């Protein structure tokens, strides 16, 4: 039986935050109100909305909630009567807020900017409106040694004019 | 300014979330005491273990801790004392766990099997051994983490070189 002089070992971390990200939402709860979900994504239908064709901007108004309690209880929100805000190719995406803090006190936000709007597609003509995007949160970059990256969050929206 | 008739919309929410939850684990704080970080792996450095070259067995011990602290202080959890052992190609990595529930409770579970070791690689020489193993969540293990993850889960992989004597 031989002893040690020296020894070294390397052994990493990414992985298991990203277990415990995804793991977060895979055992969480959601509570759907007038909301769908097909191809990963809730699914709204709406008919309200006002859009500048010349100036090409508009808003996108939906009904319907998603309340959302995380793995444990960690993240507690509610987001309703979504608004798609566009000026170009950026925008906004608006919300009734609710979240909850840390020992059970929900607090009302009101309209809140859920998050900022990256347009890599929007056409307007006087019949129709659409656009596909990606959710920014409203520099993080010294944590991606040890953080898994971002994830895309897509939204898209079509709409009949009159 | 034209109405809208009808419309509908797609939006995926979770990836959100998710970044959500990134943004409280880069914004968290870690205290490394005698363990480096390199190539997105920390790093642990010894000098004690015991070796049978003959049967190929062993165990590697490394001083040091991690300790990480999520933005927020619901993710709490320290690791220290690691302990590399191996027999054939099946192993065990222990070491001294505290952790948080999600309630601020601190626990110490003291010295605990994290996980079960599988390696793909296991060399051993008179002078050397040397390996790389997947890391399997154990029982123990998992109620170390509070029971978040499943048994069996998947953490990060972990390799070891040591010269013997």
Request: aromatic share 10%; glycine share 12%.
């Amino acid at each position: 039986s031989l002893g040690v002089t020296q020894a070294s070992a390397q052994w990493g971390v990414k992985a298991s935050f990203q277990n415990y990200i995804r793991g977060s939402i895979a055992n969480g709860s959601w509570t759907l109100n007038g909301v769908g979900f097909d191809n990963q994504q809730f699914q709204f239908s709406g008919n309200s909305g006002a859009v500048d064709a010349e100036n090409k901007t508009g808003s996108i108004n939906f009904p319907g909630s998603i309340h959302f309690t995380g793995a444990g209880g960690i993240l507690d929100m509610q987001i309703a009567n979504i608004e798609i805000s566009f000026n170009g190719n950026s925008g906004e995406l608006i919300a009734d807020v609710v979240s909850s803090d840390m020992d059970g006190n929900s607090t009302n936000y009101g309209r809140t900017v859920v998050g900022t709007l990256n347009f890599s597609a929007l056409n307007v003509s006087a019949t129709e409106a659409s656009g596909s995007a990606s959710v920014s949160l409203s520099s993080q970059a010294f944590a991606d040694f040890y953080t898994p990256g971002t994830q895309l969050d897509p939204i898209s929206f079509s709409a009949t004019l009159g």
